[PDB]
Scaffold this active site. Structure first.
Site, PDB file in Angstrom:
ATOM      1  N   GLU B 166      -7.995  32.360  -2.378  1.00 21.03           N
ATOM      2  CA  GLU B 166      -8.686  33.647  -2.479  1.00 21.03           C
ATOM      3  C   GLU B 166      -9.573  33.930  -1.273  1.00 21.03           C
ATOM      4  OE1 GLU B 166      -8.652  33.852  -7.325  1.00 21.03           O
ATOM      5  OE2 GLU B 166     -10.523  34.167  -6.237  1.00 21.03           O
ATOM      6  N   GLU B 374      -2.962  30.827 -10.297  1.00 21.37           N
ATOM      7  CA  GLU B 374      -4.038  31.057 -11.249  1.00 21.37           C
ATOM      8  C   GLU B 374      -3.649  32.225 -12.131  1.00 21.37           C
ATOM      9  OE1 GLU B 374      -8.021  29.922  -8.570  1.00 21.37           O
ATOM     10  OE2 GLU B 374      -8.040  31.722  -9.851  1.00 21.37           O
TER      11      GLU B 374
END
Ligand SMILES: O=P(O)(O)OC[C@H]1O[C@@H](O)[C@H](O)[C@@H](O)[C@H]1O
Lengths: 474, 474
Positions: B166, B374
């Site tokens: 991220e 995720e």
């Protein structure tokens, strides 16, 4: 602070040979598939056809003089293959090449850049007879022979070239909807013919790199950008399918030489995917264009369509508003009226911001320069006494689209030019003559040729002033 | 007909070092920027921090045993940079390398595939002190030295590697929103540090091809696909801008090594575009990943945002539904609640079809395989008598998302695996402990640290059954 239109921006107007020339059987011209198709009862609006059209073949000098009066920087036209090869692939008809030589000399003598479209749907009937035209691989070398003939004869004087105009239209209308020649309604045949046309496009671009090393070439895609109806996830997924099936299916091949994978797998699952030969992918990937040609008229909004849902809808060919109905692919998507835009009397959405969106999407996905090879408003016009045509509706349409082009250029899109459809009024293959697009009115209708006299519309003087100010005054 | 999940689909679960490990000052571990940042008052929810977290550093044998009971095919964890180089650069800490060696051996001895995330937000404070961490090109070779150290020690036993987890979150949160280390609110600095992070990702992938020639590697992007609110042209345009600015800005660099041109032009017009040095583009374009890693939780719907409109809005770190408000960029887009989906107590959209859309978009734009690194539901859990945690809400979320993955695979998307977040409950930096994500409940809350004992939730047994049937039974 909007960026200005670049100094050599190609301010243009466009036509197509079958729609404008006439002289269908003169000076050695062979039959095209459109000569034959339009004369079958029921195929065209009120049985209109291009036997005479607006007689540009004989009147091109008057028409080019009007282009010069307007100050056109570019004129995009198509070459009639059946004038050059009356039987498609035999001996060359010199009188055919000579017409386009005279036309190009007329353009150049008035300072107008020619933009030559190789193919505008009019493959000679003899190739359809011999082997089914675009459904056969034989057309790849026959189209290449024709293209190279034009490249050698005109490449010294023509820099900008278009290969296939609206391949998605002449293929899908000719083989899925049956509304164009050969009138087939068979999705398997459609995707086979489509693949052959892709290979023909790549072959001629390859040839162009040899014969016109300093030219610029691209296909002209009929681009209607897709919208989801709203943020319902099923409608956004319908939009993903629609954009890929309707648009990436063609433009990904043009830009990358590859079909998109979700669409390919859906066709593979229906036994509809095209036959691929050894060497096909190598040819399609090696033929990068200089630009993506864009024919833009409207956006399309889509929503979820269940597996037993909507298929072929009603198409408006009469100009009675509100007569079209939703079309789509069961399981993938269907079209729906966009409540946030108006429509023409033929139910085409008026969406200038959609042009900015389409230009941005092409730049964002392919990083390609764009030549806008068609844009315009088809509407009824009234000749008022004194030979006045007040087409403020057309000015408003063109003005708003040109304004959005400037915003896309300011965003970073490399737009090379803008060609309004059309310079004079001409035949709409399926809508007759009263759906007019010209800056120049032609005095005729669906029943009578009258005198075919040319009458400048108010939009003529508007676009003259756009060109004079390089688009600073719209 | 849905396709089955492929035979070697990686059914996994994931964690992050700072959120799970504890042992913040043991065996010579250096301080990370999060060690320091979370101790400042007001930075984290109720001042929670990762001093102990859920103490996975000392209880990994117990946690891996639970994984083996569940039948996990893969476990994605991150390596703590400050455990391996307490200084960031300088001397390697062998006891730091030894912990991950013991962890990897424990996973392999139970037939569980390790997926090593190189970086999850915890750069050593020493590097922030010496030169501003990600705002300096010095971090490129320091990160590379760290990554190469891990490649050499574990390349023989670890096939799947994730570089930056991220990047868009720790860059935007750390330099635009001021919510992550170093707590800056400066868009100019954000895009500089983003560019260096891009260069760092590219350098490590190049090193990876030398040191682990038979491995697979990619970044993991925090992907919220954008939706237009409706078919209003101005709202579709807002969607084009949001998808390019929020998503293409990163994923275009990961896949093509290029920034999108319109977003670049907007930033350059504001003096915010990053500094480019010679050789930046060459490096960025050489670093093709084997897959795109995708962390997915929700979609975002956007609409037009006037030049004098919404900027940053209210975020929900409480768990009280309805607290978050719209945010956006003036003149480009602003977010709006999607009326067609439900939402969690932290106001996150529940949009499982949105995952299929996002998978389709990545395949359609980049043609890359996707590792879903995720996905999960953060919610309140109650421990009921009998060691029962009935997280039917979490099962419902996961099941619907796995079902849409199967449709994406059926569409032709190459999904390599699926890593649920998280295996055990763990620390959320900005949300604390009560927003639980785990298959395994951990006995602590934001006030009482209790004994941290592990309790299997209902979703643990559901996912055990998913893996056992390779996704046939959801
Ligand atoms: O005549 P229509 O169908 O109204 O469309 C107007 C024009 O733009 C496109 O469709 C084609 O390139 C032209 O052949 C012409 O059709």
């Amino acid at each position: 602070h909007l960026k200005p239109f670049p100094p050599e921006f190609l301010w243009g107007a466009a036509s197509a040979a079958y729609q404008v020339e006439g002289a269908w059987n003169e000076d050695g011209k062979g039959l095209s598939v459109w000569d034959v198709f339009a004369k079958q009862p029921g195929r065209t609006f009120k049985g209109t056809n291009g036997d005479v059209a607006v007689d540009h073949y004989h009147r091109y000098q008057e028409d080019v003089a009007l282009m010069a009066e307007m100050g056109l920087k570019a004129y995009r036209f198509s070459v009639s293959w059946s004038r050059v090869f009356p039987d498609g692939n035999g001996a060359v008809n010199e009188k055919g090449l000579d017409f386009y030589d005279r036309l190009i000399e007329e353009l150049r003598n008035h300072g107008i850049e020619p933009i030559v479209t190789l193919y505008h749907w009019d493959v000679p009937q003899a190739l359809m007879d011999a082997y089914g035209a675009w459904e056969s691989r034989r057309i790849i070398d026959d189209f290449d022979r024709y293209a190279v003939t034009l490249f050698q004869r005109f490449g010294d004087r023509v820099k900008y070239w278009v290969t296939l105009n609206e391949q998605n239209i002449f293929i899908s209308f000719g083989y899925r909807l049956g509304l164009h020649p050969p009138g087939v309604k068979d999705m398997k045949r459609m995707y086979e013919a489509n693949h052959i046309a892709n290979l023909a496009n790549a072959k001629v671009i390859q040839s162009f790199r040899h014969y016109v090393p300093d030219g610029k070439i691209g296909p002209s895609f009929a681009y209607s950008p897709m919208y989801p109806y709203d943020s319902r996830p099923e409608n956004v997924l319908a939009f993903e399918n629609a954009e890929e099936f309707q648009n990436h299916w063609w433009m990904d091949v043009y830009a990358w030489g590859m079909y998109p994978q979700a669409a390919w797998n859906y066709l593979e699952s229906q036994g509809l995917e095209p036959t691929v030969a050894p060497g096909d992918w190598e040819l399609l990937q090696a033929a990068k264009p200089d630009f993506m040609g864009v024919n833009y008229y409207q956006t399309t909004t889509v929503e979820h369509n269940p597996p037993d849902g909507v298929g072929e809808g009603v198409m408006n060919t009469t100009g009675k508003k509100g007569t079209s109905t939703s079309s789509g692919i069961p399981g993938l998507f269907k079209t729906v009226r966009n409540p946030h835009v108006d429509t023409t009397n033929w139910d085409w959405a008026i969406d200038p911001v959609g042009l900015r969106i389409g230009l941005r999407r092409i730049a964002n996905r392919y990083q390609l320069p764009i030549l806008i090879t068609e844009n315009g408003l088809g509407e009824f016009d009234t000749l008022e006494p004194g030979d006045i045509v007040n087409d403020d509706y057309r000015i408003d349409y063109l003005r708003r689209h040109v304004q959005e082009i400037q915003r896309a250029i300011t965003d970073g899109v490399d737009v090379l030019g803008y060609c309004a459809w059309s310079f004079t009024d001409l035949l709409s293959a399926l809508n007759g003559y009263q759906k007019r697009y010209g800056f120049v009115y032609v005095n005729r209708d669906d029943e009578s040729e009258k005198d075919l006299r040319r009458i400048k519309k108010k939009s003529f003087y508007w676009y003259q002033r756009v060109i004079e100010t390089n688009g600073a005054e719209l």
